């Protein structure tokens, strides 16, 4: 199910919000590394966390 967090959406009603989740979920393609799975991908496995470029501690120091 959808997990809530600090970063919220930008929709007024709940129907607009639920429609956005349905659009995003219907585009998800699971890529698992374990055999005997309907979504199995030894190579070309996608990450589930987006990388963000930030100034490190050595940068600002």
């Amino acid at each position: 199910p959808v997990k809530e967090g600090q970063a919220k959406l930008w929709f007024s009603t709940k129907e607009e919000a639920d429609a956005y989740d349905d659009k995003m979920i219907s585009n998800i393609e699971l890529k698992s590394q374990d055999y005997e799975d309907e979504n199995f991908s030894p190579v070309f496995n996608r990450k589930t966390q987006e990388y963000f470029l930030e100034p490190s501690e050595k940068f600002k120091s």
Partner: protein, 119 residues
């Protein structure tokens, strides 16, 4: 301000002046000269001058600013970023207040109205 990833190269060339500079797209080959490992998305490499900015941040995160950042791959990234935002700021102002200097503008060589032809 350019509101896209790509721009026509001819639209930033002068029509009534000698063309001594161009406004080239980001040099993606410089991205492969970084020796360390880093994550870069292809969705950020075409917008003007931003690739050189991200390369500078990656170099200033791996190395610092003292005796380790001073290598040819990192100094060219910072120089390109500074030069790119300077040229684009000048071309942007020239595009805004001197649009008639560039190829493709209808005022570079104005076509006359039919009432001026005397027919």
């Amino acid at each position: 301000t350019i509101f896209a990833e790509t721009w026509e190269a001819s639209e930033y060339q002068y029509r009534n002046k000698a063309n001594l500079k161009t406004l080239p797209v980001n040099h993606l080959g410089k991205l492969a000269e970084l020796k360390f490992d880093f994550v870069e998305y292809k969705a950020h490499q075409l917008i003007a001058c931003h690739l050189y900015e991200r390369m500078t941040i990656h170099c200033m995160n791996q190395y610092g600013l003292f005796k380790d950042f001073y290598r040819p791959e990192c100094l060219d990234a910072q120089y390109y970023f500074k030069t790119c935002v300077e040229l684009n700021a000048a071309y942007g102002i020239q595009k805004k207040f001197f649009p008639e200097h560039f190829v493709g503008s209808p005022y570079a060589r104005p076509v006359p109205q039919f009432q001026q032809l005397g027919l």
